[PDB]
Structure formats: C-alpha cells, structure tokens
Amino acid sequence: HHMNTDERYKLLRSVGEECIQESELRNLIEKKPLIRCYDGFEPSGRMHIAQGIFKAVNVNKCTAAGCEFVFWVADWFALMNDKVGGELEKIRIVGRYLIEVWKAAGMDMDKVLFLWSSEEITSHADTYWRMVLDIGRQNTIARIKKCCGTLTAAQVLYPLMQCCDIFFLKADICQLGLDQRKVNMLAREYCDLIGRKLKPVILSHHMLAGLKQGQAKMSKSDPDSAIFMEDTEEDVARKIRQAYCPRVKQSASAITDDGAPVATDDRNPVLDYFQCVVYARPGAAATIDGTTYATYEDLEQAFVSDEVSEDALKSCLIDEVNALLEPVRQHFASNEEAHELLEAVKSYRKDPAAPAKPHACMWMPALLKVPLDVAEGMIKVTKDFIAAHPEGTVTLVLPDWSAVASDEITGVEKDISAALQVNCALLKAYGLPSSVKIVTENEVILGNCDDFWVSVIGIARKNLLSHVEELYGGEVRNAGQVIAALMRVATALMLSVSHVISTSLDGHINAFAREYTKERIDCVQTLEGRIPALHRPGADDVLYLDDNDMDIRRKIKKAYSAPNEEANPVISVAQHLLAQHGALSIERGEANGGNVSYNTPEALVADCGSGALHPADLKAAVLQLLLDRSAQARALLNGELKKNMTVLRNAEKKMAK
Numbered sequence: 001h002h003m004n005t006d007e008r009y010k011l012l013r014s015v016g017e018e019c020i021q022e023s024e025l026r027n028l029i030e031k032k033p034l035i036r037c038y039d040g041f042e043p044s045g046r047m048h049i050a051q052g053i054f055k056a057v058n059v060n061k062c063t064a065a066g067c068e069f070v071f072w073v074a075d076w077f078a079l080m081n082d083k084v085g086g087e088l089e090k091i092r093i094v095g096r097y098l099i100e101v102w103k104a105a106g107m108d109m110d111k112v113l114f115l116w117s118s119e120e121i122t123s124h125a126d127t128y129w130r131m132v133l134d135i136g137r138q139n140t141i142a143r144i145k146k147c148c149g150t151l152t153a154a155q156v157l158y159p160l161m162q163c164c165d166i167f168f169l170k171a172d173i174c175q176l177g178l179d180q181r182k183v184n185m186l187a188r189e190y191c192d193l194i195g196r197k198l199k200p201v202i203l204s205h206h207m208l209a210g211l212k213q214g215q216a217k218m219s220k221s222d223p224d225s226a227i228f229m230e231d232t233e234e235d236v237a238r239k240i241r242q243a244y245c246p247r248v249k250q251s252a253s254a255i256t257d258d259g260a261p262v263a264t265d266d267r268n269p270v271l272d273y274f275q276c277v278v279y280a281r282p283g284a285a286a287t288i289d290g291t292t293y294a295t296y297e298d299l300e301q302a303f304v305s306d307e308v309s310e311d312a313l314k315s316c317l318i319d320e321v322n323a324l325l326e327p328v329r330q331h332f333a334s335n336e337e338a339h340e341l342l343e344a345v346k347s348y349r350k351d352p353a354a355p356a357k358p359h360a361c362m363w364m365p366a367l368l369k370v371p372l373d374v375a376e377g378m379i380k381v382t383k384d385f386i387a388a389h390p391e392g393t394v395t396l397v398l399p400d401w402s403a404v405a406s407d408e409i410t411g412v413e414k415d416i417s418a419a420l421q422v423n424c425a426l427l428k429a430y431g432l433p434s435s436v437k438i439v440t441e442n443e444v445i446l447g448n449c450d451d452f453w454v455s456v457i458g459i460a461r462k463n464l465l466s467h468v469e470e471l472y473g474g475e476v477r478n479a480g481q482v483i484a485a486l487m488r489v490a491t492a493l494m495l496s497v498s499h500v501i502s503t504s505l506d507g508h509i510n511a512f513a514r515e516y517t518k519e520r521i522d523c524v525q526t527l528e529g530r531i532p533a534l535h536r537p538g539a540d541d542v543l544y545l546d547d548n549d550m551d552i553r554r555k556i557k558k559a560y561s562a563p564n565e566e567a568n569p570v571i572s573v574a575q576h577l578l579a580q581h582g583a584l585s586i587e588r589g590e591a592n593g594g595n596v597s598y599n600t601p602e603a604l605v606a607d608c609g610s611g612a613l614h615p616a617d618l619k620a621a622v623l624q625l626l627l628d629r630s631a632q633a634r635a636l637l638n639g640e641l642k643k644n645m646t647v648l649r650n651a652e653k654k655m656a657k
C-alpha cells in the first residue's frame, strides 16, 4: 500500500505534539524525496520505555511517510574523560547497545542512519566549530541562557554545538522532544541571520509522563518513575500498580516556551502510556475482559465511566508493556553478541603542565587601526620580558578565531585575518623583536583540534557564566565573547605559557588564565599612555601604525599645542620620543634661539612653559622624528601590504553604514 500525499502528511504530522510550520512540513512531503529527520542523544546506558518503544513508533512513522531518519549520537563529550579511562569506546558500546534495543523493538532500519559526533565533527572541525562560534557571535547571551540562584557554568556552549549539528547534518526536520524546543527554535532564528529562506521544521514529540504523582516526565534519580527496557516483568507489574491514575479525561497540555513538562493532578501516566506506547502503534488496540477498545478515546471513556476498574486498566497496561518488552528480553537472552553489550552496559555501573623555561604570551589587538600607544606598549613589554628572561621566549597570538566569535571589527573572518596580518606586519617593522614567534589561533587549533576544544570545555565546565561576564566588566556583548575568554585560556595552556601579557584592550579577560591555573601563570601588564590623543584635553586625532606620511603630517598639524604650556599632547609625544632615543634635538635659526638638544625632559618643559622653544619648532622636530621612526612601516603600506590594505578600507566602508 502506497500512501497518497495527504496520508503521508497526516502520518508524519501525527508524530509531533507541535509542528512549527505545517506549511513547511507539507511542502517537504510534496516536493522532497528523502526528507531528513534527525534526533540526537548522549548514550546514558539505561533506556526508558519512551526511548525504546515510543521513539521507534515515531521513527517508523517518519520512514513510512518517506523520510530518512538520522540519529546524531552525541558521543563527542566522551573525549573529556578519554586519556584516562578511554570512555569513548565505552560510550560507543552503550550506544551500540541502544541501537540494538532499537532493532529488537522493531525499528525499521532500512531508512535509518546513525552518526557519531566524535567521528563526524572531527572530520570537518573547521566547518563545524566555526559555525559554533558564529552562532554565539550573532546572539545575545540572554538568548543562549534560554536554551538551558544562578548556577550556570559554560553550558552556554552546549546549545551552540547542538544548534550547529542541525545545520551540519542538513536536517530538514528536527524530530526531537518538546523540551529541546528552544535550541531548535534558535536554529530557525539563525537561518534568518544567514539570509537562508529554507528553515528547519520543528516536529516536537510528546514527553511521556512520570509514573508517580507530581513528576511531569521520567526522573533520572527515581527508577520507579518510568519503565525501563531491562526491567523484568515483575518490575513492570510493581511500577505500574503503584502508578498515579486520576479518573479524568486527558486533554492536551498547553505548551510553554520552555518545552518543559509540568506535573498536574489531572495528568494520568497510565493513560499516557496507553496513548503513547499502545495506540500510537499503527494497528494496536487494548482489550479488557473480552471487549476491545479501538481508539485510545474508547478506553478513556471506559475508565472514566467506570466500566474498566482502575486495577483492570493497570492490569491491561502491564500485560501490554510486558508484551512489548518480551521480544527485547529474549533477544538479549539468546543473542550472545547482544547479551555481551548488556553485561558491558551493566559493568559500567561501577560508580596541565608547567614549562621548564619561561614563556610569555601576547594577543594582537583585533583592530582595523591600531594606536601607536598600544603598539609601542607591546614592543616594550616584549623587550622588557626578554631582558628579564634571556633564556625565555615570547609569543604573539593572532586571534583569527576568537576575534570572529566576539564580533570584532566587521565580525567576518577574511576582514579580521587581514586586519591582524597587516597590523602585525607593521608592529614587527615598528620594532617588535624578531625573537618573538608569531602564531595564529588557526595554527594552534589545527595543530591539536581534538585536544583544543576538549580543553575549551574542560575549562568551561569548571567556571561560572557569571564569572566570565565579570571578566568582561559584568556585561557581555554577545555569547561569542564567552567563547573567546575560554579559548584564550585554552591557547595559553597549549602554548605552555608561564606569563600572559595584556594590553589596555584586553582588559581583564586574560586574568582567567591566571585564575584557572591557580596562579601558576603570572600576569604582565603593558605600559601605555606615553602617546596620547592629539586634541586639546576635554576621531582621526590618534596616531596609528598604518598612518602613511600624508596622515602623520595632518594629525601632527591638527595636534593641540599653545605657547607657554608645560603640558599638552605635542609635549607628551616629544617627551616620549626623547626617552627612547636618549635625546631630542631641534633645528632653529639663531635669533630664533639657535640649535639646541634636550637630553632631559625637565629642561624641555622648562623651555616650553617659559621661554622660546616655540611650539612650531617642537612640532617640526617631533613630526620629523615620527617620520624617521615609521619609514619601514610606511614602505610596507604602499609595497608588500598594498593588496591586503584594500580589504581593510572595504571593511571600514561597511561599518560606517
């Protein structure tokens, strides 16, 4: 029997307690041959009747209605505890057992796939993890909290990973529990954020009610709240018998944004199992004392009218459920290979490094135009660090991932990579030591992708979301900033770092590294404020590395200075130049004062505030000194970095919007 297109729709729809866009569901049924349903799970190893029987009923309906059904096995998290214990292979077996309960429960596997997160993710780490960070980048942290006093660790990440899966697999339908609602809804919202008309339909299935009064769904910490598949028939009888069983008809449970089942005095888990585990089966009906009830409704009518006695209804269900489970018990009884997985599942129920030589770590500012004051700061800390530790090493990280996460500059990968390579090239030319190694985050991730993201979560699971919000000042811009912070600590540990250097632009972020390693990693702070903005105290009035010679002149012209001033910006810059060089000479025509070299900043002030060091002569000498000092750098603007600069002005254009 081939179902007509209306009957296919009806059958697939029946799966869902809600359907987000039935129109979308239809058009899928009407146009698309191998509609993708996906659903996912972390192998627990103790399978309840909803995972065994009910899922199978719904998988079968989807394959019937002409879907391919992909199971996403979230086994990736097993890698956390893998170096010790090797829990990946153990969780694969728990999974393999689950699939095998599924075969024997009657899942038609013809059109059903199983994918392993561990296998799949690590085969396209690039495409996956970049999307994870983008989903965070484009979303307000408040909105990622809704997918989960204030206890929240970095479980802000789990939703992003989940939301990624949806796109990674190319799911057309999300056929998961109603409680996964908000993550799935996030995916629909995300399509909009990437100009993508076709959206995933959310076909949320019912959450089975807990057996005892006041338990909206099954309880992990109460075995009698649900029927489990390894429950021998005496257990089934005992669990049902005591079950809550109101004499009330069972209307739909109006949906909360949360997806979260709510226990009520009206809901009857005996009647829920009868709807979900019995009648949901294509041809099945329940029989009590010689009468057979064709629909769930008929049985309900019976119970409430008082034709079927509570004891009898529960007797019916027990016979019914042992009937569904018996095939599955024999199979594990007789199929050795099956049995072994079980006894394996049973047995499982048995319950950093400091670098010898010092090494500093600095993060290049993800900025389009880098101030000279920040640049010089970086060069100084480097030179200071090396002098203090000549044996040691310094490393500059270009954050070509984390900076995309935080929505830095345009928040586009190509723009940000360009901004970094240019400004870093300029920084080396401006005087950053050769001895300093330059590495990109991409280089560090590829280097050890598996371990990197594992570390990221490991760290994540030991710290509160609120704390990462503190690190950023208490508010975060987007959920991507949260990922950036974690990544930093991760990079630090992989780079085997003893010191983290921090510019003015890093704020407190980098302390995380220190706190995490329990103060083993020391913090070093940049020394800035030696080159101020050029305008009068109280724009393009800041000197940046990428200033060409035409730019400098303009800025040093506009720069504020008046006569008889002991302090202003042009003096500050002058005072700065004088310290590094060791001196500062200025050419003057005799009768304007004559040529005169200052080897001490006091003297400079002395002459400026009271005396005939005219500002014009000071600026002339300062402007020329910046030019001499910036030569190599500006040669790269017009030369080797010419092409890469193009992207940057294109970026700037965008952002002016």
Ligand SMILES: N[C@H](CO)Cc1ccc(O)cc1
Binding pocket: 039, 040, 041, 042, 072, 074, 162, 165, 166
């Ligand atoms: N989040 C669910 C319970 O932990 C399992 C899951 C479902 C779908 C996925 O793509 C990933 C995990």
Ligand code: NA
Binding pocket: 109, 110, 111, 112, 113
């Ligand atoms: Na298959």
